[PDB]
């Protein structure tokens, strides 16, 4: 059976994981003791996609914390779901990075990545058949950008034929939570585009817009933002866990959604997001969900596809629904909005339908999209990058710990060449 | 006596095999536990007929079918479902991984290490036979296993078995609708390798059945169950002459002689004209004169291909029920009188006919109705050139930029194979043009 | 304004293939080449820019070795002296005429000696006291998208095949970090360096024949001429660098027919990926000359990446394709032709 390893790097990754497991358990019935108290049998059948089996019908997941500041460890341990994790997988270091990428790739990461891969291999060889990996990490920081990219570069060198996703929480346009985001992000994309197979750009301003406008939450915290990211993470691994009339997996989505090896950056989305009162004034059907999954305000990418052209789009439904509606509505989108699609791929839409829906819904959905528009994310970074590298603002914190300007110009030119690759398939 | 093996390959294959055996078990009387309450009360006869099923000493009847998906998700529904105690475990879950919508994994990488068991079980099921005639392969262009595994399996069977009717019941890509961006790349490469080894490849399309089920059965929100429960009836109409008695029993070696003039045009179609429900089961006589026209009437075909844009190289009409032959002759004459239904100069006869006395059954929990007479029309046209032309156009639009090719070369493939599979479809699009030009006296 | 100028060369029957009375599938007329099967049902045509009909030594337009040199490489020389850069590609399945076409035999050589000797003669003619000439060579390979150097005498260990890396200097472009650069002014040095190199190349035995190349191999030359003499004194401000890059590439290795798993398939996959990226580069760069806005994917492969400054802008690329006319090599042959065809295309 197919199996996944979930590596978690940085505060964002380790705080998303505590929510992702909190949900996958709920979908599989596991309690915070590791024990099963579900009702159905579908929960335990393909449970090895994420979990492993312990002594007394307990279940222990394949999670690997890789942080370098223990401030985030005890938050996960002393939580509602921390007493199931394997303590040998709680890797931590001391003398943290400092929102530096060189202190996560070269100095402190080179001391700990051996200890981390010694656990990754253990949790791999216990798999009868490994499909791939998962890395939750936030560009803009030190350990999620540096140590995560290092682990990608080494896991792929060790396990190249498999899959290596990454649910990168990319920066935001307006208000960033770090001054040297652009450096840490460009030097991460320089090593992600060459060592990834499908990457999922997530942006927090878009999740704020979703939490405010669609869900009508006046007090949205990060637990609510991670509650959406978890949902998306679940959607891709649904037809791998639960059955369906037309199944899917990581690799089918990779073949369909990655025309070329570099353009694998995706704008995700999940439907039906609605307010807690407006659920009386709706109808959970396929067309309403397709309206949401294609609307600009639901995508977690902080970038409007109305500015660009969908090169390739996917959809992973869940629930007892029709395939005819699934085909017709997506074709209606291909036709009605044909300007926002490519002509040298006539069918720009993939489909995938499970039959076992989430804990309390009669039907759900999921959305992945590869659009030219995401060039705006990177071009912007470049326009930040050379604003600072041209004057060498925060460079001496990167060189002193081991780096050169060459490693910066390499990443700048690669990012800009990728901005140009998405640009030719936008106008003509 | 006269056996036929069924090789379901892929998700579509199993989702159709379940619908087919749900019908073949209800017709003959077999239960999901392989038992028979009715005929044993009498103590004689062969109702659970030995064409598709086997037999044992304790009454258990076992189908002659092999299942394979390279993915557990489908076959485990059989193992955990209602028909778990029927099949021998020859259902091949080798699905440590799937073919990822690429023809390269099903053909070379993930195909090897799995095919030998399929051949071995086919051999074990053939030794039980006493004059088998057939290999009905269910598969799906556009996927990986159905595209690749079918090709490899047929390539091995045509060597190891040889002069046996290796038939195919395939799903053709809808021209607008689809569920894969790299479906044409798989379809073309499937055809290029199967165009030699196969003998007759029937073809359906899920868009046409949708249009039908909303026009005739009046289903606005269908599933794949309602499509496979209609495909099972086509296959039963094909296989009825072996399982049951009948005036003009028509076997499987007779299709490939009547419908396949040349070995490269073995791509016929199918249609089931009485697709009416109980609301409309009344108010209609459902005689042969209506059905034989319905089978030729567009908006009732099962591949969206207008034969008015083409011609007819052959046609086979397999009736079943209270059908008198004279009505069939009158119907065929009426069809020959019409000007829209065009026929080639090199086939004035055109038709083959088959009649059986067993009507179609009614799978309960279904959408069809109980009719006293049903028909299946197989047909070979010059119209299907339009569809291969469309798929080649898509292939060209995508392969001019070499899109999605890295996934294929990553699993043992070469661009030469793409161009080679292209040109051998241009040759076929030229053959369809050559034969459809009337003979120069 | 770049030009590409791909070509073909059909070998004659070897004596072994003669005594079998093997058949002839490749034919010509004017310039166009065609492949007529033994079935004589499907007929093809592959018109080219240049065609070297070496099927006999009797036919008109017999493209001998001197002809192949003087028609392709000599323009590259005349451009390398003009201050431009040049690349040559040598594609061909095993048994097609490749090494004979690049290197040759002692009695009728190939392209490489006729390149280096024309170079040295024009140099020692132009070698005045005012302007000088400095040739610096290198010889490296590629293997599973890893870089390796073929100018070191490995002490016998498991390996000292240093998996070198590619970097991007902004002005001077891509380069290999840690590359030996030997100096040469007499041709007999290059032969010794190549004979120490190609022994260290990568290859293994398989079905069709044993000595089959399984790694691309680049042979690079750098001509720097110190002409600049400033008026006020002995100053040399500007100095012209000319890069020549002759690469012997491998075959495609259709692996559906040849059973191969483990390392051999890992090599074939990478060769096919590199060949596809190279075809994409050339099909975009031929359209570059026609003012159509197109982006060239140099980065998807090390081979096309390290030569971004030798296959773009101001340069003259070239591709020569050696194919057999035998009938047991029709599947292979056609592939090569189609490859070259997608490079020329107009
Ligand atoms: C009957 C009813 O109206 O309750 C719904 C509900 O109100 C809505 C609004 C739920 C609710 O979700 C939210 O309000 C929300 C707020 C911020 C961020 C994310 C969600 C709900 O909490 C969420 C919850 O969704 C689930 O049941 C899934 O299990 C969800 N995860 C969890 O519930 C969960 C359980 C334990 C611990 C942590 C999370 C899920 C989603 C995708 C994949 C797997 C699981 C459900 C039905 C509801 C409530 C409970 C109100 C919605 O949630 C989702 C993900 O579909 C929000 O809009 C949808 C539609 C639902 O109608
Ligand atoms: N009629 C019918 N067609 C189906 C069904 N399920 C899938 N299909 C067809 O199958 C195609 C999708 O690819 P599949 O045939 O499922 O490929 P596969 O057999 O699952 O093998 P993989 O590619 O490895 O997943 C779609 O174009 C559908 O038309 C079904 O239940 N009924
Ligand atoms: N969604 C979400 N984002 C977070 C969370 N914590 C941090 N971030 C984002 O991550 C960035 C900081 O990265 P950080 O986790 O500090 O990286 P690190 O210091 O190297 O571990 C900021 O831009 C935040 O927006 C979280 O819990 N949820
Ligand atoms: N133009 C030519 N004229 C005569 N013989 C040739 C010609 N080209 C190739 N050959 C013969 O073909 C053989 C090629 O061998 P080899 O150098 O291994 O070619 P490749 O490297 O392409 O396989 C040589 O033995 C040579 O005699
Ligand atoms: Mg499948």
mmCIF file of C-alpha atoms in Angstrom, chain B residues 94-373:
data_model
loop_
_atom_site.group_PDB
_atom_site.id
_atom_site.type_symbol
_atom_site.label_atom_id
_atom_site.label_comp_id
_atom_site.label_asym_id
_atom_site.label_seq_id
_atom_site.Cartn_x
_atom_site.Cartn_y
_atom_site.Cartn_z
ATOM 1 C CA UNK B 94 -0.565 -5.814 -7.672
ATOM 2 C CA UNK B 95 -1.287 -2.221 -6.795
ATOM 3 C CA UNK B 96 1.683 -1.242 -4.754
ATOM 4 C CA UNK B 97 1.496 1.677 -7.210
ATOM 5 C CA UNK B 98 -0.604 2.760 -10.182
ATOM 6 C CA UNK B 99 0.260 3.788 -13.724
ATOM 7 C CA UNK B 100 -0.164 7.526 -13.039
ATOM 8 C CA UNK B 101 -2.041 8.177 -16.302
ATOM 9 C CA UNK B 102 1.114 7.307 -18.299
ATOM 10 C CA UNK B 103 1.401 4.493 -20.846
ATOM 11 C CA UNK B 104 5.044 3.929 -19.879
ATOM 12 C CA UNK B 105 4.457 2.509 -16.403
ATOM 13 C CA UNK B 106 1.769 0.078 -17.494
ATOM 14 C CA UNK B 107 3.812 -1.064 -20.479
ATOM 15 C CA UNK B 108 7.368 -1.419 -19.125
ATOM 16 C CA UNK B 109 8.031 -0.598 -15.479
ATOM 17 C CA UNK B 110 4.951 -1.390 -13.405
ATOM 18 C CA UNK B 111 3.635 -3.718 -16.100
ATOM 19 C CA UNK B 112 6.513 -6.152 -15.773
ATOM 20 C CA UNK B 113 6.572 -8.013 -12.429
ATOM 21 C CA UNK B 114 2.751 -8.296 -12.745
ATOM 22 C CA UNK B 115 1.916 -9.770 -16.181
ATOM 23 C CA UNK B 116 3.234 -13.307 -15.648
ATOM 24 C CA UNK B 117 0.554 -14.105 -13.075
ATOM 25 C CA UNK B 118 -2.111 -12.915 -15.510
ATOM 26 C CA UNK B 119 -0.753 -15.204 -18.209
ATOM 27 C CA UNK B 120 -0.528 -18.107 -15.771
ATOM 28 C CA UNK B 121 -4.131 -17.742 -14.649
ATOM 29 C CA UNK B 122 -5.304 -17.375 -18.250
ATOM 30 C CA UNK B 123 -3.480 -20.626 -18.959
ATOM 31 C CA UNK B 124 -5.000 -22.368 -15.943
ATOM 32 C CA UNK B 125 -8.457 -21.223 -17.065
ATOM 33 C CA UNK B 126 -7.861 -22.312 -20.661
ATOM 34 C CA UNK B 127 -6.841 -25.858 -19.731
ATOM 35 C CA UNK B 128 -10.313 -26.222 -18.220
ATOM 36 C CA UNK B 129 -11.825 -25.467 -21.627
ATOM 37 C CA UNK B 130 -12.929 -27.885 -24.336
ATOM 38 C CA UNK B 131 -12.828 -25.588 -27.365
ATOM 39 C CA UNK B 132 -12.780 -22.014 -26.105
ATOM 40 C CA UNK B 133 -13.491 -19.216 -28.568
ATOM 41 C CA UNK B 134 -12.668 -15.753 -27.258
ATOM 42 C CA UNK B 135 -10.840 -13.255 -25.097
ATOM 43 C CA UNK B 136 -13.066 -10.327 -24.140
ATOM 44 C CA UNK B 137 -10.706 -7.617 -22.865
ATOM 45 C CA UNK B 138 -12.301 -4.693 -21.035
ATOM 46 C CA UNK B 139 -10.118 -1.610 -20.796
ATOM 47 C CA UNK B 140 -10.055 2.164 -21.160
ATOM 48 C CA UNK B 141 -8.046 4.399 -23.430
ATOM 49 C CA UNK B 142 -6.725 7.415 -21.560
ATOM 50 C CA UNK B 143 -5.615 5.526 -18.505
ATOM 51 C CA UNK B 144 -2.299 3.866 -17.921
ATOM 52 C CA UNK B 145 -3.149 0.242 -17.241
ATOM 53 C CA UNK B 146 -5.929 0.027 -19.811
ATOM 54 C CA UNK B 147 -3.703 1.687 -22.415
ATOM 55 C CA UNK B 148 -0.438 -0.106 -21.631
ATOM 56 C CA UNK B 149 -1.283 -3.341 -19.859
ATOM 57 C CA UNK B 150 -3.843 -4.162 -22.541
ATOM 58 C CA UNK B 151 -1.220 -3.674 -25.242
ATOM 59 C CA UNK B 152 1.415 -5.789 -23.514
ATOM 60 C CA UNK B 153 -1.098 -8.511 -22.677
ATOM 61 C CA UNK B 154 -2.446 -8.716 -26.218
ATOM 62 C CA UNK B 155 1.111 -8.713 -27.568
ATOM 63 C CA UNK B 156 1.893 -11.725 -25.394
ATOM 64 C CA UNK B 157 -1.392 -13.533 -26.054
ATOM 65 C CA UNK B 158 -1.186 -13.284 -29.845
ATOM 66 C CA UNK B 159 2.138 -15.145 -29.589
ATOM 67 C CA UNK B 160 1.290 -17.637 -26.867
ATOM 68 C CA UNK B 161 -2.251 -18.463 -28.085
ATOM 69 C CA UNK B 162 -2.553 -17.150 -31.635
ATOM 70 C CA UNK B 163 -5.665 -17.817 -33.715
ATOM 71 C CA UNK B 164 -8.220 -16.881 -31.077
ATOM 72 C CA UNK B 165 -10.738 -14.049 -31.258
ATOM 73 C CA UNK B 166 -9.056 -11.464 -29.050
ATOM 74 C CA UNK B 167 -11.960 -9.042 -28.731
ATOM 75 C CA UNK B 168 -11.880 -5.693 -26.954
ATOM 76 C CA UNK B 169 -14.649 -3.648 -25.351
ATOM 77 C CA UNK B 170 -13.099 -0.216 -24.995
ATOM 78 C CA UNK B 171 -14.115 3.282 -23.953
ATOM 79 C CA UNK B 172 -13.267 5.926 -26.451
ATOM 80 C CA UNK B 173 -12.404 9.462 -25.271
ATOM 81 C CA UNK B 174 -15.234 11.926 -25.528
ATOM 82 C CA UNK B 175 -14.329 14.730 -27.950
ATOM 83 C CA UNK B 176 -15.114 17.544 -25.497
ATOM 84 C CA UNK B 177 -15.384 15.750 -22.153
ATOM 85 C CA UNK B 178 -12.392 13.961 -20.633
ATOM 86 C CA UNK B 179 -10.718 13.216 -17.294
ATOM 87 C CA UNK B 180 -7.049 13.461 -18.251
ATOM 88 C CA UNK B 181 -4.809 15.953 -20.027
ATOM 89 C CA UNK B 182 -2.535 13.237 -21.457
ATOM 90 C CA UNK B 183 -5.325 10.950 -22.634
ATOM 91 C CA UNK B 184 -4.562 11.271 -26.388
ATOM 92 C CA UNK B 185 -0.899 10.431 -25.872
ATOM 93 C CA UNK B 186 -2.066 7.182 -24.300
ATOM 94 C CA UNK B 187 -4.815 6.445 -26.829
ATOM 95 C CA UNK B 188 -2.580 6.824 -29.885
ATOM 96 C CA UNK B 189 0.167 4.672 -28.398
ATOM 97 C CA UNK B 190 -2.417 2.063 -27.447
ATOM 98 C CA UNK B 191 -3.814 1.922 -30.969
ATOM 99 C CA UNK B 192 -0.374 1.724 -32.581
ATOM 100 C CA UNK B 193 0.399 -1.485 -30.664
ATOM 101 C CA UNK B 194 -3.096 -3.012 -30.667
ATOM 102 C CA UNK B 195 -3.855 -2.310 -34.344
ATOM 103 C CA UNK B 196 -1.944 -5.490 -35.261
ATOM 104 C CA UNK B 197 -2.747 -7.959 -32.478
ATOM 105 C CA UNK B 198 -6.432 -7.332 -31.851
ATOM 106 C CA UNK B 199 -9.155 -8.664 -34.138
ATOM 107 C CA UNK B 200 -12.178 -6.532 -33.232
ATOM 108 C CA UNK B 201 -12.368 -3.549 -30.872
ATOM 109 C CA UNK B 202 -15.802 -2.341 -29.901
ATOM 110 C CA UNK B 203 -16.019 1.231 -28.714
ATOM 111 C CA UNK B 204 -18.212 3.314 -26.437
ATOM 112 C CA UNK B 205 -18.061 6.837 -25.054
ATOM 113 C CA UNK B 206 -19.400 8.097 -21.767
ATOM 114 C CA UNK B 207 -20.739 11.355 -23.242
ATOM 115 C CA UNK B 208 -23.166 9.591 -25.572
ATOM 116 C CA UNK B 209 -24.613 7.484 -22.770
ATOM 117 C CA UNK B 210 -25.077 10.635 -20.693
ATOM 118 C CA UNK B 211 -27.004 12.289 -23.518
ATOM 119 C CA UNK B 212 -29.058 9.110 -23.897
ATOM 120 C CA UNK B 213 -29.849 8.661 -20.203
ATOM 121 C CA UNK B 214 -31.075 12.268 -20.052
ATOM 122 C CA UNK B 215 -33.032 12.090 -23.326
ATOM 123 C CA UNK B 216 -34.566 8.611 -23.068
ATOM 124 C CA UNK B 217 -34.276 7.232 -19.527
ATOM 125 C CA UNK B 218 -34.720 10.789 -18.154
ATOM 126 C CA UNK B 219 -31.854 10.792 -15.664
ATOM 127 C CA UNK B 220 -30.463 14.270 -15.042
ATOM 128 C CA UNK B 221 -27.978 13.150 -12.332
ATOM 129 C CA UNK B 222 -26.485 9.740 -13.216
ATOM 130 C CA UNK B 223 -23.496 7.718 -12.029
ATOM 131 C CA UNK B 224 -21.241 5.144 -13.651
ATOM 132 C CA UNK B 225 -23.488 2.374 -12.340
ATOM 133 C CA UNK B 226 -26.211 3.543 -14.724
ATOM 134 C CA UNK B 227 -23.723 3.370 -17.609
ATOM 135 C CA UNK B 228 -22.215 -0.018 -16.844
ATOM 136 C CA UNK B 229 -25.682 -1.496 -16.269
ATOM 137 C CA UNK B 230 -26.306 -0.545 -19.917
ATOM 138 C CA UNK B 231 -22.953 -1.796 -21.192
ATOM 139 C CA UNK B 232 -23.605 -5.160 -19.536
ATOM 140 C CA UNK B 233 -26.692 -5.486 -21.727
ATOM 141 C CA UNK B 234 -24.631 -4.946 -24.884
ATOM 142 C CA UNK B 235 -22.187 -7.623 -23.782
ATOM 143 C CA UNK B 236 -25.023 -9.996 -22.912
ATOM 144 C CA UNK B 237 -26.544 -9.410 -26.342
ATOM 145 C CA UNK B 238 -23.166 -10.350 -27.787
ATOM 146 C CA UNK B 239 -22.705 -13.485 -25.685
ATOM 147 C CA UNK B 240 -26.311 -14.738 -25.659
ATOM 148 C CA UNK B 241 -25.814 -17.115 -28.579
ATOM 149 C CA UNK B 242 -23.314 -19.136 -26.549
ATOM 150 C CA UNK B 243 -25.039 -19.165 -23.163
ATOM 151 C CA UNK B 244 -28.563 -19.761 -24.464
ATOM 152 C CA UNK B 245 -30.374 -21.390 -27.357
ATOM 153 C CA UNK B 246 -31.703 -19.612 -30.395
ATOM 154 C CA UNK B 247 -32.592 -19.895 -34.042
ATOM 155 C CA UNK B 248 -29.559 -18.196 -35.616
ATOM 156 C CA UNK B 249 -26.901 -18.519 -32.963
ATOM 157 C CA UNK B 250 -24.070 -16.133 -33.830
ATOM 158 C CA UNK B 251 -20.703 -16.781 -32.200
ATOM 159 C CA UNK B 252 -17.594 -14.639 -31.767
ATOM 160 C CA UNK B 253 -15.585 -16.022 -34.689
ATOM 161 C CA UNK B 254 -18.324 -14.670 -36.979
ATOM 162 C CA UNK B 255 -17.955 -11.027 -35.951
ATOM 163 C CA UNK B 256 -14.386 -10.626 -37.156
ATOM 164 C CA UNK B 257 -15.272 -12.013 -40.607
ATOM 165 C CA UNK B 258 -18.302 -9.784 -41.250
ATOM 166 C CA UNK B 259 -17.330 -6.477 -39.617
ATOM 167 C CA UNK B 260 -13.546 -6.435 -40.217
ATOM 168 C CA UNK B 261 -12.742 -6.223 -43.950
ATOM 169 C CA UNK B 262 -9.081 -5.273 -43.459
ATOM 170 C CA UNK B 263 -7.036 -5.885 -40.292
ATOM 171 C CA UNK B 264 -6.547 -2.143 -39.673
ATOM 172 C CA UNK B 265 -10.233 -1.065 -39.594
ATOM 173 C CA UNK B 266 -11.312 -3.340 -36.732
ATOM 174 C CA UNK B 267 -12.928 -0.500 -34.768
ATOM 175 C CA UNK B 268 -16.705 -0.960 -34.718
ATOM 176 C CA UNK B 269 -19.318 0.625 -32.471
ATOM 177 C CA UNK B 270 -22.368 -0.400 -30.458
ATOM 178 C CA UNK B 271 -25.843 0.761 -29.502
ATOM 179 C CA UNK B 272 -28.814 -0.442 -27.451
ATOM 180 C CA UNK B 273 -31.965 1.147 -28.813
ATOM 181 C CA UNK B 274 -34.599 0.176 -26.190
ATOM 182 C CA UNK B 275 -33.255 2.343 -23.370
ATOM 183 C CA UNK B 276 -36.694 3.336 -22.120
ATOM 184 C CA UNK B 277 -37.969 3.271 -18.546
ATOM 185 C CA UNK B 278 -41.235 2.077 -17.033
ATOM 186 C CA UNK B 279 -42.886 5.465 -17.551
ATOM 187 C CA UNK B 280 -42.218 5.074 -21.294
ATOM 188 C CA UNK B 281 -42.194 1.263 -21.379
ATOM 189 C CA UNK B 282 -45.902 1.630 -22.039
ATOM 190 C CA UNK B 283 -47.273 3.813 -24.852
ATOM 191 C CA UNK B 284 -44.852 2.014 -27.201
ATOM 192 C CA UNK B 285 -45.064 -1.238 -29.151
ATOM 193 C CA UNK B 286 -41.291 -1.783 -29.246
ATOM 194 C CA UNK B 287 -41.512 -3.833 -32.419
ATOM 195 C CA UNK B 288 -38.517 -4.509 -34.628
ATOM 196 C CA UNK B 289 -39.508 -1.796 -37.091
ATOM 197 C CA UNK B 290 -39.001 0.832 -34.394
ATOM 198 C CA UNK B 291 -35.832 -0.621 -32.874
ATOM 199 C CA UNK B 292 -33.907 -1.232 -36.096
ATOM 200 C CA UNK B 293 -34.439 2.448 -36.912
ATOM 201 C CA UNK B 294 -33.563 3.575 -33.393
ATOM 202 C CA UNK B 295 -30.261 1.728 -33.732
ATOM 203 C CA UNK B 296 -29.513 3.777 -36.859
ATOM 204 C CA UNK B 297 -31.100 6.978 -35.585
ATOM 205 C CA UNK B 298 -28.453 9.352 -34.230
ATOM 206 C CA UNK B 299 -28.978 10.505 -30.644
ATOM 207 C CA UNK B 300 -28.990 6.777 -29.739
ATOM 208 C CA UNK B 301 -25.441 5.750 -30.650
ATOM 209 C CA UNK B 302 -22.881 5.090 -27.919
ATOM 210 C CA UNK B 303 -19.984 6.897 -29.608
ATOM 211 C CA UNK B 304 -20.518 10.546 -30.525
ATOM 212 C CA UNK B 305 -19.786 10.066 -34.206
ATOM 213 C CA UNK B 306 -22.371 11.064 -36.777
ATOM 214 C CA UNK B 307 -22.473 8.314 -39.441
ATOM 215 C CA UNK B 308 -24.178 10.781 -41.776
ATOM 216 C CA UNK B 309 -20.672 12.248 -42.086
ATOM 217 C CA UNK B 310 -19.522 8.803 -43.256
ATOM 218 C CA UNK B 311 -20.630 5.427 -44.541
ATOM 219 C CA UNK B 312 -21.187 1.834 -43.428
ATOM 220 C CA UNK B 313 -18.708 -0.927 -44.218
ATOM 221 C CA UNK B 314 -20.744 -3.538 -42.331
ATOM 222 C CA UNK B 315 -23.395 -4.033 -39.668
ATOM 223 C CA UNK B 316 -24.499 -6.799 -37.296
ATOM 224 C CA UNK B 317 -27.877 -6.832 -35.570
ATOM 225 C CA UNK B 318 -28.218 -9.252 -32.655
ATOM 226 C CA UNK B 319 -31.841 -9.574 -31.594
ATOM 227 C CA UNK B 320 -33.144 -11.260 -28.464
ATOM 228 C CA UNK B 321 -36.722 -11.987 -27.460
ATOM 229 C CA UNK B 322 -39.996 -12.635 -29.244
ATOM 230 C CA UNK B 323 -38.574 -11.668 -32.640
ATOM 231 C CA UNK B 324 -39.816 -13.152 -35.905
ATOM 232 C CA UNK B 325 -37.243 -13.084 -38.767
ATOM 233 C CA UNK B 326 -39.608 -11.596 -41.354
ATOM 234 C CA UNK B 327 -39.795 -8.409 -39.314
ATOM 235 C CA UNK B 328 -35.992 -8.270 -39.400
ATOM 236 C CA UNK B 329 -35.981 -8.635 -43.187
ATOM 237 C CA UNK B 330 -38.576 -5.888 -43.557
ATOM 238 C CA UNK B 331 -36.550 -3.665 -41.228
ATOM 239 C CA UNK B 332 -33.287 -4.226 -43.111
ATOM 240 C CA UNK B 333 -35.095 -3.519 -46.380
ATOM 241 C CA UNK B 334 -36.471 -0.271 -44.966
ATOM 242 C CA UNK B 335 -32.966 0.715 -43.864
ATOM 243 C CA UNK B 336 -31.602 -0.077 -47.315
ATOM 244 C CA UNK B 337 -34.297 2.111 -48.867
ATOM 245 C CA UNK B 338 -33.222 5.251 -47.014
ATOM 246 C CA UNK B 339 -30.797 7.653 -48.673
ATOM 247 C CA UNK B 340 -29.162 9.045 -45.531
ATOM 248 C CA UNK B 341 -27.882 5.606 -44.490
ATOM 249 C CA UNK B 342 -25.014 5.335 -46.963
ATOM 250 C CA UNK B 343 -23.380 2.034 -47.867
ATOM 251 C CA UNK B 344 -20.157 1.339 -49.715
ATOM 252 C CA UNK B 345 -20.126 -0.019 -53.251
ATOM 253 C CA UNK B 346 -17.978 -2.939 -52.052
ATOM 254 C CA UNK B 347 -20.614 -4.226 -49.591
ATOM 255 C CA UNK B 348 -24.147 -4.353 -50.997
ATOM 256 C CA UNK B 349 -25.141 -7.092 -48.552
ATOM 257 C CA UNK B 350 -24.051 -5.187 -45.460
ATOM 258 C CA UNK B 351 -25.884 -7.017 -42.738
ATOM 259 C CA UNK B 352 -25.421 -9.981 -40.484
ATOM 260 C CA UNK B 353 -28.326 -11.113 -38.313
ATOM 261 C CA UNK B 354 -28.535 -13.010 -35.055
ATOM 262 C CA UNK B 355 -31.637 -14.105 -33.153
ATOM 263 C CA UNK B 356 -32.072 -15.484 -29.653
ATOM 264 C CA UNK B 357 -35.180 -16.333 -27.666
ATOM 265 C CA UNK B 358 -34.083 -15.285 -24.169
ATOM 266 C CA UNK B 359 -35.118 -11.678 -23.480
ATOM 267 C CA UNK B 360 -32.949 -9.291 -21.492
ATOM 268 C CA UNK B 361 -33.356 -9.445 -17.746
ATOM 269 C CA UNK B 362 -34.007 -6.571 -15.347
ATOM 270 C CA UNK B 363 -31.247 -5.906 -12.827
ATOM 271 C CA UNK B 364 -33.301 -4.674 -9.835
ATOM 272 C CA UNK B 365 -32.256 -1.409 -8.329
ATOM 273 C CA UNK B 366 -31.842 -0.279 -11.926
ATOM 274 C CA UNK B 367 -33.145 2.199 -14.470
ATOM 275 C CA UNK B 368 -34.094 0.058 -17.463
ATOM 276 C CA UNK B 369 -37.452 -1.614 -18.064
ATOM 277 C CA UNK B 370 -38.710 -5.108 -18.814
ATOM 278 C CA UNK B 371 -38.936 -5.354 -22.596
ATOM 279 C CA UNK B 372 -40.015 -8.391 -24.589
ATOM 280 C CA UNK B 373 -37.456 -7.751 -27.345
#
